[PDB]
Design a protein. Structure first.
Lengths: 188, 190
């Protein structure tokens, strides 16, 4: 038997302490829970950042410029009438060593109060069919300075002829590397 | 009339991540070890990375032909034969993480130079993004403010697949090498 929903609040991701995670479990339940079809897989990743959470949020909120904190993006365009609002889209030109491929992504969540955003891939990425992702930002006061934790989760289809392990390993590696780039951009 | 190959000229362009004076010390090594024959369907690049570690330590990491996953991303596993020798001509089978079904890249050791700390390999089967990939890594120690500072140079030549542009192939291969050099920094520095 296979799961029908994720339970990421039960498994501590690498890169956070138990005391940090205890403070984040409610946010994982609220924003990082997915229903699962039998052909889907899902993961939750974390990254500590020595920077104020408002600064980190201003970076990951920039839906039109994902290349600032992600690798393997040649360019990203938005329409001439683009609005920073749920339902708007972006066209991402991905670096893959294959011919030019455009990934159309839709902004799903933009919550400035809780500092949560997310997107869905609606066309053009074949390795990651029906990819959907959520990023949340969390500030901690530690001895007079802000320490930020970013949580990033996704759900995605496992292509036919792939194993779940193969798909998860690929998607997890990309997210981990992108979170490392976010660290370099946000920290001073 | 005998044919006249075209060669790369990476000694003429300072790579990002080294200063003009650092690179000036490395140009001879680039001419000696990082020069490829170049056809119109190929592209080639030279990348650099400064590492705050002794060069013998860095060399012992990049010399480990059977364990590339220690300093490279996107490798699930790497196997060598039950009779493997650490010698030019030996091969390794690299299981690559790509989001495609399982794919093995067979790679051959081309250079293993312990005096100059240079190694290199060629992909001889199984990797289609990088057909006829050939790569060289060299390690260079500098005495800098009382400590050894190391520069690693990594270059490649590769075929551009039909339906790809040169820019796209180079952008992909360069990004992979750059990210791997960052992982090498993480492993070598203490």
């Amino acid at each position: 038997t296979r799961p029908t929903y994720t339970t990421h609040h039960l498994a501590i991701p690498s890169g956070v302490t138990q005391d940090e995670f205890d403070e984040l479990k409610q946010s994982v339940v609220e924003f990082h829970t997915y229903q699962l079809s039998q052909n889907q897989c899902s993961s939750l990743l974390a990254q500590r950042i020595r920077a104020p959470n408002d600064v980190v949020w201003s970076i990951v909120r920039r839906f039109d410029q994902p290349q600032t904190y992600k690798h393997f993006i040649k360019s990203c365009s938005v329409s001439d009438n683009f609005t920073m609002a749920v339902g708007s889209t972006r066209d991402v030109n991905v670096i893959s060593g294959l011919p030019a491929a455009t990934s159309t992504e839709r902004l799903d969540i933009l919550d400035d109060d809780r500092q949560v955003t997310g997107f869905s891939i609606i066309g053009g990425e074949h390795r990651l069919r029906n990819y959907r992702s959520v990023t949340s930002v969390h500030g901690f006061n530690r001895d007079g300075a802000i320490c930020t934790v970013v949580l990033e989760s996704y759900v995605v289809d496992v292509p036919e002829g792939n194993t779940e392990e193969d798909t998860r390993l690929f998607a997890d590696t990309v997210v981990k590397l992108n979170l490392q780039k976010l660290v370099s951009v946000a920290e001073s």
